[PDB]
Amino acid sequence: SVSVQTHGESSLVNKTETWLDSTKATRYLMKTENWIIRNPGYAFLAAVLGWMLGSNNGQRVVFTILLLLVAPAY
Amino acid sequence: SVSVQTHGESSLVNKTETWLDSTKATRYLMKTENWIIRNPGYAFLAAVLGWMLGSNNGQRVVFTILLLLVAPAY
Amino acid sequence: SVSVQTHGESSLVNKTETWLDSTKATRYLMKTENWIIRNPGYAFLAAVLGWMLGSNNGQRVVFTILLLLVAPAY
Amino acid sequence: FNCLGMGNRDFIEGASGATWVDLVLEGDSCLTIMANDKPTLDVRMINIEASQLAEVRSYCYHASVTDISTVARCPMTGEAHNEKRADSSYVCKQGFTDRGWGNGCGLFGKGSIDTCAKFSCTSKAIGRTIQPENIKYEVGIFVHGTTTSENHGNYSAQVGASQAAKFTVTPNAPSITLKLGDYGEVTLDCEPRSGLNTEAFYVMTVGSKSFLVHREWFHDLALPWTPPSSTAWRNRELLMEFEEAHATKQSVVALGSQEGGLHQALAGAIVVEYSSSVKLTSGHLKCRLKMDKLALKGTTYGMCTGKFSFAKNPADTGHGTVVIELSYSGSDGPCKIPIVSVASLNDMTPVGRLVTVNPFVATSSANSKVLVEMEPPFGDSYIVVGRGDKQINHHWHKAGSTLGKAFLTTLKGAQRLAALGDTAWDFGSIGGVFNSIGKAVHQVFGGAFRTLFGGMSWITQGLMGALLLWMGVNARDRSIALAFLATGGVLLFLATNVHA
Amino acid sequence: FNCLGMGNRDFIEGASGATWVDLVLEGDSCLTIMANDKPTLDVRMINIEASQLAEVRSYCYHASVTDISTVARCPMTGEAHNEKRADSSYVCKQGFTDRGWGNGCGLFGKGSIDTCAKFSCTSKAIGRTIQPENIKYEVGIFVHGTTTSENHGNYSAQVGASQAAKFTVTPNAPSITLKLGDYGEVTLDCEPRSGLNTEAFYVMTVGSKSFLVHREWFHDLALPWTPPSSTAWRNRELLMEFEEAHATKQSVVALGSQEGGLHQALAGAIVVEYSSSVKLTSGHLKCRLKMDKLALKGTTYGMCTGKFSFAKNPADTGHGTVVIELSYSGSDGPCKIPIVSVASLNDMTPVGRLVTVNPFVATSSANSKVLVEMEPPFGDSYIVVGRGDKQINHHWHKAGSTLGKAFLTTLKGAQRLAALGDTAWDFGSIGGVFNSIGKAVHQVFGGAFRTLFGGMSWITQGLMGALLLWMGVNARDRSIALAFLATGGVLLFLATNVHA
Amino acid sequence: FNCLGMGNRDFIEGASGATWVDLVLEGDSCLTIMANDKPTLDVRMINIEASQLAEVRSYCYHASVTDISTVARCPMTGEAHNEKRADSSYVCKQGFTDRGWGNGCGLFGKGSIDTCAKFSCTSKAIGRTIQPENIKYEVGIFVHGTTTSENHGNYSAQVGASQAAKFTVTPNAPSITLKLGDYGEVTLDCEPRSGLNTEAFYVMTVGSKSFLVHREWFHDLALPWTPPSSTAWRNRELLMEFEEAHATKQSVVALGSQEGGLHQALAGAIVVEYSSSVKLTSGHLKCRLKMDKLALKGTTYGMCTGKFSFAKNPADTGHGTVVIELSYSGSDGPCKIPIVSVASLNDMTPVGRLVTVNPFVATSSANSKVLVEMEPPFGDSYIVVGRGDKQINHHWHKAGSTLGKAFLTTLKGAQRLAALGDTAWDFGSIGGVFNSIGKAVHQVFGGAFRTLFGGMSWITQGLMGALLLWMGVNARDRSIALAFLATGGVLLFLATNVHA
């Protein structure tokens, strides 16, 4: 909407300053952090489930740190 | 913003009709679909990488169908 | 339509003669026969494929005689 | 209104133990009850009259199409827009045609055209609905007294004879008692709510004739439909065709009338008579009947004193009984009319039973005629026309030997079991134990399963059995019967039930 | 204010053993209690009125930007400083642009420019808060006496009838007794502190309409905000844009109004009516109700002496009960109105129960009408109106067979479990053992866990189950159920709870 | 229009072997070519002017809603129909509300209501498109002759000096030769078709400011849109809200203006200037340049006879070169101006090269000033001004030691590789073997792959590398490099390219 599916960014040609760059680089981190800072309990039980399955070590972490991005913005 | 981190939804008490419900249920699907319908090439190479790693079958799919949600809305 | 999805038949209560019964009993056979009498070549290669698979005998025939109804009316 | 001569006629063996017993009657059939000390009663549906109707939705099965117009646009100029979109009286369709310099435009390969046309109904279909409080039942009821050949079928007389009566029942007046005079009065207890589901389906009218159809099926119909009154429709394209767009010029054409397909479509629908109201033919109705005040007049009268005669010759009912007509010379009337049913003239011991108990001479007028029926037993017999020398008698065969009759009854029972559902156990009147549970069993059993995959048509379910059979054919012991019950029965029989 | 016709209506089976029983009521729903020897009671929320409000912080969702000014400096001359930094009425931003001899300066490649502009609000947002001592509850209460079609929904009459009353409750007056007159008086015991957390969230107003919003969420709004009254703001850049610095000339531009996004943003917010005060729709409130002084007037009166009549025809409540209206010819009023609910006319034994016990003729005036409801049982039945030949009766179906009730009961509970949390056990009134612990169990269980990872939205938690499921799918015995409880339930159900 | 002082400035080392060499220029940057026997040339974009525009579709981002009306119906009366459906000027929505006797109707639980309201645009958005034949390019071109501090940046003079010229190029006039006078004439060969895809996207205007936006993305905007001119819209609900239907009374409300979200939405869009036409800032344009008729005037003149002077002091370009200004006392002009770039005063052997070959005294007028640039080499050196005792000299550092140049060269290429795609190989002018294939390689390689999963945003693709890396981290030999090329590069670098 007016919200989601921002054209940002076309980003062709253009050596210059884009409409809002400073916002854009900062956007994706915050709105996720704000939510995760909120309900950390989520991450706790989340992280556990990663260590549960696959037992190959690091690839387990691959689930978790990934999964932590899932809950933000569904 | 005015866009992201919608209070939607408080959703306490309230047996009644919420401000906009009809929108809300429909929102999350479309703005993702619109984007994925757009660049299907993404999903192709995406799906392959899932089958690449972990070789436990279905848990490989767990990555993919998950991963397909990642690219929408970063 | 006016053609397909005939209400025929409600058929509740009614000890009496229905709107058109004589047609109805005769309908389903003919319009299939007419078509199968037409292109028998269909049935030939059709019947073979049944004997091809499953090799349990009669259950193979189950496919065929069934399958012969499929092609009529798609 | 009598049970005479109706193609489908059944009797009821009074079990005593009550003046009340439960009944279910049908449009065509007529029911006849014989129970000791009680006369013989006739009840049959007349019709089902519903009064006031409401109109759910509509359909236009044949429509007109006029006022073709289209507006082209050059390529890259986007969608065209015809003003006529401003009115629901048109259907607009966009379109596009490839474009040369030779025609009108400065780039090649595409375009836009907007076709619109007016839309109007040739002739339309009307659905209607029924509100249960508008239901009626016309039921005539009859008892066998003195009758002639003429008066018998006729309702005028028996009113005076007070041996028959008509009445209406509604959920507003769910039960009534009504006087036959001399024999006393009787009591009907019915359940108008249960006759139909007035909300199971709709009244539909197409042109003249009209039809009962399922409510769910009506919504699906693929065709222009309308809000209840009202104005203008949905999906109103499907009667129209767009040709190949040709430059500026495209034509749109209406299909031929679909009216036939409707008639084609309707099969299970049941003909009805619709002007202001509707009259069903086949009703399905449960009732209870209370006989206490019913008694026997005439027990006073003695034997009749004079010769008898046969106006009409003995003849068969086809239901297994026999009627005759008698005229009587003497003037001693009213007098009790001696007759019986016997094996050989060497015996006076009756065997069969009178259809009408105690034939009753109406009047003292000579050469009156009397209409009387009995049920002789199997094989050969005689009809003794009163004792005394003057006794005359006739010799009337019947071939019906008990096993054949029993077998026929079983087939009839199966049909009754089918299409009458749970309620079919009501023939088992004054139930409990066997009968009460038999309706309880069939209740969830038939109310599910057979009706759950229901919606099958002839071979659809008809085929299934054979396919099911092979499962029963090849299976494991104690798995067989479980599967077999699915295979045979419940399916093939109704498949045979429909012959035709 | 009555329970008539409200879309959501439930009953309560009086367990006796007390004149008191515990209740929880809701904005939409209306509650109805039947307990022996006691009339039938109606209680429902009216609204929630809060009085005085306080203003935490503010927001300007749409702002104006004017008075662009900028001051360049040569390279190596450090940061520029515009005087306008001396006032909070501006936003200053530094900047720099590469520099030639051709423009103004004696070295190449860099510079300094200081851009400032005035900042002002197009139109702004106001948050507000609620102090619990400002809460109210308007609760009407009602008992079923003599009513007509008209007066029934109307509050004017029943005041005179004294069969209904409205009142306010506060933490200042947490419980009240109030007189219905003849039936006695009853006692409500509630807990205004528990209705909401007045501090759980804020009242927010955007333009006209206003909204309840988690004060939690409400802080992290990204937009100009203000100290409570006051003057001038923080983070007031985010409505402005700086272009590419061009020599001396750079422009700054305001974004378009954000007002939409707010409306977009708000979803779970609940519409409210804000001028001086607020009126909620859906309340959540616990109460206890004490019935001792409630009694039954009318036990004096005898059977009514005259014909009955149906003003309105029987009709369904949709909640599983049936109301009708009666008018009465005779003048004997006040008199006790005979009626029951029966199986067949062969029996006078009632089966169902009266919604309103002892219908009561109001007055001696002829042709008054009386409004009465009952609950027939499943299947078919009759409504006996009066005794003796006068007795008229109507035949009213119901299809509701017990099992489907048992289910629609359960899920309805299940729904009423969800979103009503621990308190949902209050339907289990006069608890202990089972019910008391069931609230104790859910207490820490729901007060954690489900609410700890709470903040999920639809698929967010909705997806989780399937992902969880695969864990339950592939796991070890006795580990399965532990994981499975996480997988299914608590999650998928509320995911189904929202359909829609 | 000159290359002086532009933030981004690059040079080109003439390989001889042709009077022609291929170039690509950009909006911001300015290009400078030094090749033997040939003067030094300056070319830079001015702007991109497009002339005539066309309007694809429209949007109304903020709308008005008035004329609420609704028509109820009793339950079972089907859908309601409001007449206003007869006009596209309204949006109609059906609806239904539960119904009591208390309000208006003879059955309970349901109903029908038809809500309609008029719909109108507060203010709307306009898209537009560009037809390639409407493109232009303003390109100024410049050669270094006699200049002062003033005239240099100024276009008025150099016209008279004939050392600079402006011109337009179109697909209609794809190449032009143009005379500088004394130095001869030169030839530009460009490809206007290739500058942009005029059909890659649209011109969009929102309120005042306007934007370039992928026509692709531009369709899926969710909002009321319109046929190109025209009248009335599609999907025009999404600015409206329907409240809870309340009896007859329901309200519908417009959302706040969405204008902000648009501005929010647009990021990658590029500001443009739209009134009648548009002026881009950043162009992307390929050209070839033919130098044959270019020659060197002044070879006649001899050494200048008099003292020199420094009007402005030496200063750095920031691109690695150094300009100074000289004024000259003597009257001998025009005369050839001796200068060089030297290591130590013990040597007269030049080392660096003149930016402008053969500084040229314009006139005989005393105390004229002359603007001249050179490129000294690394470390320390001197600037020899004149010969003989008159000779004065200045000592100008540079820290730039070669290696750091080699790097800042590379990455700059790497950046200039990215976002310049295949065409980036055009810096490799007069190609073949290496360069020609390097564009051929990148052609299908970049024209697929990187652009096939393209549409990634920052972390989206930015994250991928690390995830990819772990694959390269744990893999098999000879599978590693195949996977690793995917992991590193092509991805992380552009992820670093954006810093910011």
Numbering used by the authors:
A (entry chain D), B (entry chain F), C (entry chain B): 1 to 74
D (entry chain A), E (entry chain E), F (entry chain C): 1 to 500
Which sentences did the original study use to describe this structure?
Although several different flaviviruses may cause encephalitis, Japanese encephalitis virus is the most significant, being responsible for thousands of deaths each year in Asia. The entry of flaviviruses into their target cells is mediated by the interaction of E with cell surface receptors. There are 180 copies of each of the E and M proteins per virion with each icosahedral asymmetric unit containing three copies each of E and M.
Here we report the cryo-EM structure of JEV strain P3 in its native form at near-atomic resolution. A final resolution of 4.3 Å (the ‘‘gold’’ standard Fourier shell correlation = 0.143) was achieved. The cryo-EM structure of mature JEV (P3 strain) reveals an icosahedral virion of ~ 510 Å in diameter, slightly bigger than DENV2 and ZIKV (~ 500 Å). Three E-M-M-E heterodimers lying parallel to each other form a raft and 30 such rafts cover the viral surface. The structure reveals unusual “holes” between two monomers within a dimer, formed by cooperative shifts of the k-l hairpin, and i-j, E0-F0 and B0-C0 loops. These holes are surrounded by five encephalitis-specific motifs, which have been proposed to play a key role in the attachment of the encephalitic flaviviruses to their receptor(s). However, JEV (P3 strain) failed to close the “hole” under neutral pH conditions, perhaps because a number of residues highly conserved in the JEV group, including Asp28, Arg44, Lys166, Glu243, Glu244, Glu273, and Lys279 may, together with His264, produce enough electrostatic repulsion to maintain an open conformation at both low and neutral pH. There is a notable hydrogen-bonding network centered on Gln264 near helix αB. It appears that replacement of Gln264 with a Histidine in the attenuated phenotype of JEV could further strengthen this hydrogen-bonding network. Residue Glu138 of the E protein, which is part of motif 3, is one of the points of greatest divergence (in terms of both sequence and structure) between the encephalitic and non-encephalitic viruses and we demonstrate that it plays an essential role in the attachment of the virus to neural cells.
